[PDB]
Design a protein around this ligand. Structure first.
Ligand SMILES: OC[C@H]1O[C@@H](O)[C@H](O)[C@@H](O)[C@@H]1O
Ligand SMILES: OC[C@H]1O[C@@H](O)[C@H](O)[C@@H](O)[C@@H]1O
Lengths: 320, 319
């Protein structure tokens, strides 16, 4: 039984792949729309019959809290019982994990080409790792090396309070608080949050935001067509740095801080020139605590899939 | 039979004996840092007074523990762990952060050392966060990895202050103008209370007094100063909110623990406060933290206890 099933579901998209159990290598990736199938189980059935593979074991990352046996997505209508699904497909193992648990578990598998460093020096081996990423949501997980085991620590850290550093970011906080209630980091660091930032800068200035999508703000910011857009993106990069630096301090993250691509590669050279690193380190006397911690942009295309394979293989008894 | 354990913070160094077989602490004594040129000196005084031979120690210190050089901000006192180990002739000399120590105590605390503030029951083997406001703001996490609890130190007290209202933002900007970066510790700590009090005053366009942290709690509890009362109220809410962020960030279904620094001296005020609703005030993620218990630790020496646990475990004992 050479392959296990691996997957990465985020709102409407479900990508399934094969992981070679011996090497952890990913192959035969294929994507489906969630709108076209009534459940994750149905798309797995289709994927498996459609290639011609027999699997016993699988691991699927989902972009929502995995809190127990019943999983209900927020950004799509799928809702399912893990145990019910494992039974129905006849698997021996069926791990459902959070998407950032999966991304954290890809970290040990990542090599230099997959990483772009933004500041700091070198990781201190065996020391904790933080991973986060702004996409549809703000994801955060942590990773620690205990013995020979990579231990991911999943959370919902994208939902902590947003911490403004300026009178300006504070007016933005007020505006968003006036309109929604609790303002989380996710409210500003994500696709939707980039748009929240734009609307709020424009609104702070008593003007009327146009109905822009995240790709629009990014598009105009890079093109220089919109100073509001460029301000939104600039602030986003700054809040991004501060947020990651907070994670570095909170768990003593000398093994490094990882950003899981998401929206960021869409604007790599803008990010590269931004205040990101300097926001990362802007921690008063604690600048020196975080100053040598490296940040890496993860640029693998499918870290969720890789991470799912890694998580499974460790569960299967393998050492990475 | 005996090992040396320690709890060094600021002005003071508390030293005691730990029974290596049971983990019990005895002969605790608290020395003033000002009266001594080094922690090593203090240790020699203590070990001279007590008539036991000790080759093993663990000292918890209220500062980041990176490598071999340990630099105290609240005293100075800076030292080499390797050098101290050598000078004193120890087999093992473990030097840990103070919240590392407190986290190591949690697994041996019994219901009398705990006072619960909301939520339900811990989910067994799930992560724990511990924090506490004292001379500084400490944070550490504990995770259950392969049959044992593992301590995750850090400097989580120094992350940005995250104001949730227009008023706390006004305080943020007031503190931002006077100093730079405003960390959570700027507001959740003894000195934090003074900062809150000053900022509350300046914001009502008045001039603050040169008050001390115990001044704040006294006048609050005596109800003899509406600015001090207000600061304390606000401290309780920020404390709840800060604890809620910790729980969200590491999924701490194991529970959140507060190490009593300044809190027990206003215990009933704290119980009456907005603490728990602030802890839970997380938008749609209210439900994620609603069942996570908070416990105040009322054990008098969690640092000494946890230094002992840390050392005994290092010496091969299963806890
Ligand atoms: O997609 C990244 C993150 O988005 C958040 O809104 C969800 O609550 C997390 O579970 C997820 O990891
Ligand atoms: O004493 C509580 C905390 O205070 C902070 O100021 C120090 O940086 C920490 O190392 C310590 O754990």
């Amino acid at each position: 039984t050479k392959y296990a099933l691996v997957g990465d579901v985020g709102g409407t998209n479900a990508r399934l792949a094969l992981c070679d159990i011996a090497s952890g290598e990913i192959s035969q990736a294929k994507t489906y729309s969630g709108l076209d199938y009534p459940s994750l189980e149905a798309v797995i059935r289709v994927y498996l019959e459609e290639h011609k593979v027999e699997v016993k074991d699988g691991c699927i990352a989902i972009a929502c809290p995995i809190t127990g046996d019943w999983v209900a997505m927020t950004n799509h209508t799928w809702a399912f019982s893990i145990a019910e699904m494992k039974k129905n497909l006849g698997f021996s193992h069926l791990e459902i994990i959070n998407d950032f648990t999966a991304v954290s578990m890809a970290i040990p598998m990542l090599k230099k080409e997959h990483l772009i460093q933004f500041g700091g020096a070198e990781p201190v081996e065996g020391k904790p790792i933080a991973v986060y990423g702004a996409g549809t949501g703000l994801g955060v997980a942590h990773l620690v090396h205990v013995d020979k085991r990579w231990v991911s620590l999943p959370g919902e850290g994208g939902h902590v309070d947003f911490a403004p550093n300026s009178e300006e970011e504070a007016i933005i906080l007020e505006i968003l608080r006036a309109e929604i209630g609790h303002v989380s980091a996710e409210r500003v660091l994500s696709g939707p949050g980039l748009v929240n930032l734009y609307r709020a800068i424009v609104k702070a200035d008593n003007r009327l935001p146009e109905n822009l999508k995240p790709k629009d703000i990014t598009e105009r910011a890079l093109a220089d067509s919109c100073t509001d857009c460029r301000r939104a993106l600039s602030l986003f990069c700054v809040i991004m740095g501060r947020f990651g630096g907070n994670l570095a301090l909170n768990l003593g993250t000398f093994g490094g801080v990882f950003i899981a691509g998401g929206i960021v590669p869409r604007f790599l050279e803008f990010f590269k020139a931004s205040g990101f690193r300097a926001a990362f380190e802007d921690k008063g006397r604690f600048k020196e605590y975080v100053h040598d911690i490296p940040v890496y942009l993860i640029v693998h295309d499918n870290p969720g899939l890789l991470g799912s394979g890694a998580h499974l293989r460790q569960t299967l008894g393998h050492i990475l």
